[PDB]
């Protein structure tokens, strides 16, 4: 099979910048190359066919060039809705093969997260488990540190994070962190706190509640 | 408009078979070849094979020759792909396409697992105390398989909504949170999350009550 | 122990008939006479009639001669009463009873069933909605906190309400239903506790409406946390 | 038919007092008279047969006497669990006939109600109706006045009360009052108050909340 490589897997650029995505083949494919866009939604659309030809509805800021083993997709001025993964595909020989893809995200100004903490419901708690949720809303960049404290004791190995895809409009991320405890363990302790470190914060923000008492 | 409508998500057991359908419209079915593509979670696209609807001739990627069987029904403009001898490695999204691959279906999620279906529990996320925005949500916990859909107020509330990607817990069940941020002053507004887990035929409406004392 | 187990509550339409059963145990069915009694809501007891299970002989209050028919099934130790040509005036609780004989001819109704509620109405069955009554601590100097469940818009009677699957009984007040102008019933069930907060205890009301086959568990959120 | 009369329909006495309940017949019944006890829950038990004989399990503080047309049931020292309705029944002639019954309640010391107000849930409110509940807990005597005020305007004809039977332990009553409004009407006004008058209160107690906050 013909190996298709996209040497850059991850890429970020500012709004209005010119972006170029690389695609290389293990042998000459004689311009038989297409480009696809996949949104975070999972929906796929054709951008370019036969190296340089535009598909219906594709704006002219998208263009493609290359020959032999090496090809390029260019986005002349980056709009927010260009957030996607871009895939090349050869049809020189069967089987058709795709590149590993290049994920494109936007550089914006730094934005501090709004932080919220949520105690477990009694409805959950009566069944023997407690989920405590810390929410970081609409921040940039993605890098963020969440630390759980229970009576000021740092927790480890009992939380999981989930992060949204970059928003198509404001180009921010949101993050949830869930601390899971037994009912018994939950009812030993009093103060529940998530501490957030992020670039947009001058110093770490703590949100906390006390479990009654 | 050209359109390819694929069948819904499916949980199936290892060693068994599954059949995915692709209902076309907006063009003459018999005039275009149909190709199928695989995408494993977090991975690239793989060409499975193609079928010529008019006669029924097929060509397969050698990697899928003992895996996939493609058929068509000309009377209903529908293409089918059957995957046999299923393993966990066959868990993926599968796309039908029209031949470049100029139009794509929305994808079908196949989960291969011997584990049973389980509907979610839905708990409220309400803050403890009574800024320009407050936050609330629903925790959708302990379901299998993917996916769940979450809406707010029967779809009338979309502004400020973040439904996080599910994470697989160590229990082997999925969990996610859906949160809303809304104007801090909310007095006249109620907030109800609508959770649908089709695999288990579960529909849950949970109104999130404020802790206002 | 002597026991008379009556059939569950029944909604039936005017002009129709209904059959109530009375399943006995703890004694020999054919050795004791059985009597039936009517009690309208807020009213006194009325004798309907009696039946001799061994042969099936009956005597009726003349007021119920065009109303009631009593039978027995000896194989299942069960007495039956059928009420025909139903009207709203037949809406009542009906009791089966055992008659004991003492001297020559001293008679009394020594054991009673728990009663069967018959509602005669053209209206349809409707299951309740269950809403929380959420505890707000109004002052710091509160010696008791209170929460509950509102069980609204059901028909017919009755509903049963328990707390924490029956494990919580102290401090519970389940009020009598009131008929709303809509023709549907509503009641509240409340719990009060000595204000030591609530402890590690949660509060779930269990609502059962047999006529509609509705069972609802509703956890009432305490909201016993604060950020500050 | 023989008319059986219990001239006293309602009776209250202190714990430890001696209570006598009367039963008269429209003609002589020659001692063919039984007594029954009905608890608030609706369960019925035989107390006395043939004027004076005790049924199994009936404590000896119960006794019965009489002849001809006039009969008496006596409770020698009143316990709290004697709260019930008592019925006489003749079997001199068919049909068997019962007296109208005598309800027995306990005299205790005056006890002020604890008052609580509950706003409507959002879960109810979204469906277009608002129920506001005022609770009066564990008071004596039964007589009590609840007035609803909405922005200090006395409400009329839009509430319903319910009162528990006397508690078998502490001999108190409780009362609920429900004010019912449309969602629209509810959302016109701000301050919701129930005002309680009772003998154990030095002056009327008002509990209130403001809607929104």
Closest CA to D116 of C128, C193, C151, B127: C193
Tell me the CA end-to-end span of chain C in Å, nearest whole number.
60
Residue C57 distance to chain D (closest CA, Å): 15
Please enumerate in sequence order all residues whose Cβ is within 8 A of that of A57, keeping only pairs 6 or more positions apart, or say none: none
Q: How far apart are CA D115 and CA D146, in angstroms?
A: 10
Domain-located, residue C97: yes
Tell me, yes or no, whether B125 and B142 share the same domain. yes
Closest CA to C158 of C209, C114, C115: C209
Q: How buried is residue A20: exposed, middle or buried, by Cβ count under 10 Å (0-12/13-18/19+)?
A: middle
Q: How far apart are CA C18 and CA A36, in angstroms?
A: 72
Residue C225 distance to chain B (closest CA, Å): 5
Residue A191 distance to chain B (closest CA, Å): 13
Residues C187 and C159: beta-carbon distance below 8 Å: yes
Contact B128 C226 (CB under 8 A): yes
Domain-located, residue B212: no
Question: Would you give the DSSP letter of residue C155?
Answer: B
Contact B127 C228 (CB under 8 A): no
Residue D15 distance to chain C (closest CA, Å): 22
Residues C90 and C82: beta-carbon distance below 8 Å: no
Residues D200 and D154: beta-carbon distance below 8 Å: no
Q: How far apart are CA A180 and CA A187, in angstroms?
A: 13
Residues D213 and D171: beta-carbon distance below 8 Å: no
In Å, how far are B20, B169, B198, B199, C72 from B112, measured between CA atoms? Answer: 14, 17, 16, 13, 60
Mutation choice for C interface testing from B206, B208, B211 by most C CBs within 10 A: B211
Taken in order of first residue, the domains within chain A and their CATH numbers are 4-107 (2.60.40.10), 114-210 (2.60.40.10)
Contact D122 B209 (CB under 8 A): yes
A52 CB neighbour count, 10 Å cutoff: 16
Q: What CATH number is attached to the domain comprising B71?
A: 2.60.40.10
Question: Would you give the DSSP letter of residue B118?
Answer: B
* Buried-exposed string D152-171: b where 16+ CB fall within 10 A, e elsewhere: eeebeeebeebebebbbeeb
Q: What residue spans of chain D are helical by DSSP H? A: 122-125, 183-186
C128 CB neighbour count, 10 Å cutoff: 25
Contact A160 B169 (CB under 8 A): yes
| DSSP line for B94-106 | EEEEE----EE--
Q: What are phi and psi of D79, to 5 degrees?
A: -95, 160
Tell me, yes or no, whether C7 and C97 share the same domain. yes
Last residue of a domain, one of C101, C120, C139: C120
Domain-located, residue C152: yes
Tell me the CA end-to-end span of chain B in Å, nearest whole number.
55
Q: How many residues does this entry show for chain A? A: 213
* Residue D177: both structure tokens together: 């009052």
What is the number of alpha carbons within 13 Å of residue C130 lying toward its C-beta?
22
Which residues on D lie below 8 Å from B191 (Cβ)? Answer: 122
Tell me, yes or no, whether B92 and B135 share the same domain. no
Strands (E), B74-148: 78-83, 92-98, 103-104, 108-112, 121-125, 133-143
Residue D19 distance to chain B (closest CA, Å): 49
Closest CA to B185 of B126, B134, B117, B143: B134
Tell me, yes or no, whether B107 and B132 share the same domain. no
Strand order in the sheet with B78-83: B3-6, B18-25, B78-83, B68-73
Contact B128 A119 (CB under 8 A): yes
3-state secondary structure of C76: helix
Last residue of a domain, one of C70, C97, C120: C120
Q: How far apart are CA D50 and CA A78, in angstroms?
A: 102
Tell me, yes or no, whether B27 and B108 share the same domain. yes
**Domain count for chain C:** 2
The residue in chain B having the minimum alpha-carbon distance to the alpha carbon of residue A164 is B164
D84-90/D97-98 β-pairing? antiparallel
Tell me, yes or no, whether B33 and B134 share the same domain. no
Q: How buried is residue A191: exposed, middle or buried, by Cβ count under 10 Å (0-12/13-18/19+)?
A: middle
Q: How far apart are CA D69 and CA C187, in angstroms?
A: 43
The residue in chain B having the minimum alpha-carbon distance to the alpha carbon of residue C134 is B211
Last residue of a domain, one of B94, B112, B130: B112
Tell me, yes or no, whether C134 and C56 share the same domain. no
Q: How buried is residue C165: exposed, middle or buried, by Cβ count under 10 Å (0-12/13-18/19+)?
A: exposed
In Å, how far are A99, B167, C114, C123 from A82, measured between CA atoms? Answer: 19, 26, 73, 60
Which residues on B lie below 8 Å from C147 (Cβ)? Answer: none
Tell me, yes or no, whether B29 and B100 share the same domain. yes
Residue C228 distance to chain B (closest CA, Å): 7
Tell me, yes or no, whether C90 and C142 share the same domain. no
Measured at the CA of D162, the angle between CA D159 and CA D166, to 5 degrees, comes to: 155
Domain-located, residue C186: yes
Domain-located, residue C166: yes
Q: Which of B130, B188, B207 sits opposite D123 (nearest CB)?
A: B207
Structural domain boundaries, residue B95:
3-112
* Residue C118: both structure tokens together: 């018959």
Tell me, yes or no, whether B53 and B141 share the same domain. no
Chains A–C, number of C-beta pairs less than 8 Å apart: 33
* Residue B127: both structure tokens together: 């803050």
Domain-located, residue B29: yes
Q: How many residues does this entry show for chain D? A: 213
Tell me, yes or no, whether C75 and C141 share the same domain. no
Which residues on C lie below 8 Å from B124 (Cβ)? Answer: 221
Neighbours of chain A (3+ CB pairs under 8 A): B, C
Domain-located, residue C224: no
* Residue C213: both structure tokens together: 């086959």
Contact A210 C226 (CB under 8 A): yes
Closest CA to B5 of B73, B70, B78, B75: B78
* Buried-exposed string C17-27: b where 16+ CB fall within 10 A, e elsewhere: ebebbbbbeee
Closest CA to C174 of D143, D165, D105: D165
Which residues on B lie below 8 Å from D211 (Cβ)? Answer: 187
Domain-located, residue C226: no
Contact B211 C228 (CB under 8 A): no
The residue in chain B having the minimum alpha-carbon distance to the alpha carbon of residue C227 is B129
Tell me, yes or no, whether C111 and C174 share the same domain. no
In units of Å, what resolution does this entry have?
1.9
């Amino acid at each position: 099979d013909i190996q298709m490589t996209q040497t850059t897997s991850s890429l970020s650029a500012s709004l209005g910048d010119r972006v170029t995505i690389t695609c290389s083949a293990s042998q000459g494919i004689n311009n038989y190359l297409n480009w696809y866009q996949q949104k975070p939604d999972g929906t796929v659309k054709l951008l370019i066919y036969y190296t340089s030809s535009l598909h219906s509805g594709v704006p002219s800021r998208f263009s493609g060039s290359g020959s032999g083993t090496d090809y390029s997709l260019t986005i002349s001025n980056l709009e927010p809705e260009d957030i996607a993964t871009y895939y090349c595909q050869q049809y020189s020989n069967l089987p058709y093969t795709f590149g590993g893809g290049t994920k494109l995200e936007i550089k914006r100004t730094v934005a501090a997260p709004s932080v919220f903490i949520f105690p477990p419901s009694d409805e959950q708690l009566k069944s023997g488990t407690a989920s405590v949720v810390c929410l970081l809303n609409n921040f940039y960049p993605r890098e963020a540190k969440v630390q759980w404290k229970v009576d000021n004791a740092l927790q480890s190995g009992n939380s999981q994070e989930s992060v949204t895809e970059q928003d198509s409009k404001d180009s921010t991320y949101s993050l949830s962190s869930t601390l899971t405890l037994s009912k018994a363990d939950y009812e030993k302790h009093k103060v529940y706190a998530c501490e957030v470190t992020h670039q947009g914060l001058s110093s770490p923000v703590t949100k906390s509640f006390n479990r009654g008492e | 408009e050209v359109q390819l409508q694929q069948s819904g998500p499916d949980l199936v057991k290892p060693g068994a078979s599954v059949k995915i359908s692709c209902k076309t419209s907006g063009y003459t079915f018999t005039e275009y070849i149909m190709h199928w593509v695989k995408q494993s979670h977090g991975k690239s696209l793989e060409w499975i094979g193609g079928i010529i609807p008019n006669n029924g001739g097929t060509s397969y990627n050698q990697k899928f020759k003992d895996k996939a069987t493609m058929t068509v029904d000309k009377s209903s403009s529908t293409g089918y792909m059957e995957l046999r001898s299923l393993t966990s490695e066959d868990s993926a999204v599968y796309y039908c396409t029209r031949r470049a691959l100029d139009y794509w279906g929305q994808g079908t999620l196949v989960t291969v697992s011997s584990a049973s279906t389980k509907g979610p529990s839905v708990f409220p996320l309400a803050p403890c105390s009574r800024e320009s925005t407050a936050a609330l949500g629903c925790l959708v916990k302990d379901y299998f398989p993917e996916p769940v859909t979450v809406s707010w107020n029967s779809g009338a509330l979309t502004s400020g909504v973040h439904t996080f990607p599910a994470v697989l817990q160590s229990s082997g069940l999925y969990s996610l949170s859906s949160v809303v941020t809304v104007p801090s002053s909310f007095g006249t507004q109620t907030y109800t999350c609508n959770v649908d887990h089709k695999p288990s035929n579960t529909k849950v409406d949970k109104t999130v009550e404020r802790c206002s004392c």
